[PDB]
Write a protein that binds this ligand. Structure first.
Ligand SMILES: CC(=O)N[C@H]1C(=O)O[C@H](CO)[C@@H](O)[C@@H]1O
Ligand SMILES: CC(=O)N[C@H]1C(=O)O[C@H](CO)[C@@H](O)[C@@H]1O
Ligand SMILES: CC(=O)N[C@H]1C(=O)O[C@H](CO)[C@@H](O)[C@@H]1O
Ligand SMILES: CC(=O)N[C@H]1C(=O)O[C@H](CO)[C@@H](O)[C@@H]1O
Ligand SMILES: CC(=O)N[C@H]1C(=O)O[C@H](CO)[C@@H](O)[C@@H]1O
Ligand SMILES: CC(=O)N[C@H]1C(=O)O[C@H](CO)[C@@H](O)[C@@H]1O
Ligand SMILES: CC(=O)N[C@H]1C(=O)O[C@H](CO)[C@@H](O)[C@@H]1O
Ligand SMILES: CC(=O)N[C@H]1C(=O)O[C@H](CO)[C@@H](O)[C@@H]1O
Ligand SMILES: CC(=O)N[C@H]1C(=O)O[C@H](CO)[C@@H](O)[C@@H]1O
Lengths: 85, 88, 93, 93, 91, 88, 85, 93, 94, 92
């Protein structure tokens, strides 16, 4: 989470930036601030894991602009589509 | 403008209470007290609503605003309180 | 509480913001507004004295009040609902 | 010779980063002291880059072995045994 | 497993590289014993990449901490504490 | 060189996004999404920005280049596009 | 305003001559040409008007290296600072 | 004395001009057929001045009654009832 | 406001001033003038009691009103168009 | 834009990316800042003019250090260092 308690239903619009700034129209005026009572984000906890086991053993791992995933392990060199899930 | 635009559904689109995107481009819709999620339709033969996945089974009609923070967190105004969490 | 949030926020606009049919962002941070059946685009105001509505370009000619939903996909596509019809394209220009 | 004809775009501190790479739009991304930073590349030695970067990650960014962009704008990351992907974050909140 | 179900495109020498990366058009760039090579990526183990690569960089290549392409084709680099950009070299 | 030089301001001067002259010698400055205009300052006691005239009110911080043609027109590059007009 | 469409931000430098030629650095090369989509200049439309009646009535009107404005109007001779606005 | 000891710095076409005067730097200014021309004075009969002059003004220069320089390098002009000043133009643009 | 400007200027001359075919300064501020076929030079006047034409040296005897243009370069050289021809030289001197 | 360049005159052909500043004084002299040095010389008129070779070094060190460096129409050089603003005739 409860992040505010009074008047929240009173805005005419209430919506975010692409950078997460909260915007609000109230009483014909317009406001910008970060939302009330935010938490630290932690991206990894919300990300899709797509592989599990040995991923840090690659000496390089990087994409071609065509979207294939290139990789070096030991002496060898691999391309496939990225893994998915 | 509607001239050059793909039509991507026909019935029902006006009976949604909210209708909007998460940062990933999945589509969200509230109807009949429920919250639905599926990727947007690309044309009229996609019974979007028939495939959507009911991520919220009741309670979703009370909302004054229902929308996404760009980090993926879902925000909600009910009555006069303001709420946030990851989507269910 | 909303009033003290509003207390510590920045007042970046001061009149004429109630009257828009729609007010939302594309993914590149431009602000769109529908008013008097028209569509408008421009940088958000950074302060009280920015006459945002004078400043803004009319990308959209008429009809715009007639959309039930009008909102942006993250890939920059404009999605709109009219009557019971769902549509999609790049934004007007 | 490349170095002699190169434009110098920053005069100190570049050594501190553990990753430094572009997304497909050419925003420059950086990990420093376990934090994640984003902004348009700098352009002269007086472009203080770190002081105008957005700190979009507050902690844990130094545990990754790889951190890099798919052309589709998704960020991929390897931590320990695991491989992950997600849109990059936009705020540390 | 991913490795299993993937194409092998190279078979030896691949860790001799200090840098190994793409430009926006898909040429493979590589640093190795202080030099910079460039050629279109390999396709199978039968392909001898370093034998068909152009040396485009003569010396000093391994002094960089970072070395990577901007989508617009400008090549960026950190050496020591300083930062640089410019069109890649070309032979 | 800063040996022989006149110091004509002491704060905020870095922090302008652009900083330049028209052909007549007025100084122009972009900061906080605004365009300011006033004759240059001749000393520290001159609060340039407090006197500058805000000849543009919002929209100014988008620009990759902002500069005068020597006949008095103001050229500007926003994103991909290139512009000119007499100054506001 | 519009005078240019794709690419205008590619350049490293983009600035004028004293004579109005536009210079440009792109991809490590320097170009000079007239800017695109120029208009005829018309100086009188942009000049500062400093006076408003009977100015053409003078037989002579000309400056001393002083900056004093000298003027003859039928048989009499005058000097003063030029007018201002 | 004067005509006999004078240097001849040009030999036809001088009659066409409606104004002809110096700016404080000593560049030569001329109006002819409603156009404004500017270049360093010529120096001999073979110095074809008008073929190397920049056409800095391309119309309405004939409607002026006076056109002259302040020592500070501003161009003053009288046209009809009105009086004006500005830096001289530098191109017909 | 041509009258407005005049009203507020020093009146520095009273009559005769309209007989001048040319009337201009050199780089140092000497005033030159042509009437009849003659060139006069002196320091400019500063009130109507100053009889300028009476203190000016005649520095040019005849031919002065044959010019279309007669004017000083900043470096002190004197330029003239006569007919279709153009000339420069140090001004004459008496 | 690509075709603006196509009809422009190419008057320089390598090494122009590296400057920190590249601007004109009111008399038409070109100034460039490179490797912490200020250079001055009339602009090339063609590809084969090795501009950086002929240019006179007129400022010996410090030149990369200004955030702005630019000319007033009356010929004065204005510069910004850190939080501070300056002006003087250019060096020589
Ligand atoms: C809201 C919704 O899901 N609408 C779709 C639906 O019901 O099936 C139709 C075809 O059967 C589509 O054209 C509709 O747009
Ligand atoms: C709707 C809109 O753009 N409103 C702006 C406006 O009209 O000018 C006021 C002062 O200029 C600003 O405070 C307003 O926010
Ligand atoms: C790491 C980073 O952003 N460094 C910039 C910085 O600290 O300011 C300096 C000058 O002010 C720049 O030259 C540095 O490159
Ligand atoms: C380093 C390596 O090849 N790891 C494989 C593995 O065994 O675990 C995952 C199963 O989800 C796969 O995605 C990986 O390819
Ligand atoms: C680094 C490099 O160029 N490696 C290739 C090479 O030496 O030729 C072999 C085929 O003979 C391949 O196994 C290698 O991938
Ligand atoms: C950018 C600007 O206008 N700066 C001036 C300012 O804020 O007032 C000071 C005196 O109080 C001056 O010395 C500053 O240079
Ligand atoms: C060859 C030559 O002298 N031509 C005449 C001419 O062409 O006009 C120039 C400018 O009017 C003058 O200097 C010359 O008088
Ligand atoms: C051309 C000339 O010299 N005019 C003066 C003159 O003739 O004597 C008058 C009485 O002294 C003056 O007032 C005149 O300005
Ligand atoms: C900065 C500079 O002067 N570059 C010039 C240079 O180095 O010589 C080349 C041929 O000599 C020219 O094409 C370049 O423009």
């Amino acid at each position: 989470k409860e992040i505010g308690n009074g008047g929240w239903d009173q805005f005419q619009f209430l919506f975010f930036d692409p950078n997460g700034y909260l915007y609000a129209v109230s009483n014909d005026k317009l406001y910008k601030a970060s939302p009330p009572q935010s938490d630290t984000d932690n991206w990894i906890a919300r990300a899709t894991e797509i592989g599990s086991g040995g991923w840090s053993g690659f000496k390089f791992l990087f994409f071609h602009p065509n979207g294939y995933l290139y990789a070096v392990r030991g002496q060898r060199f691999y391309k496939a589509l990225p893994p998915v899930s």
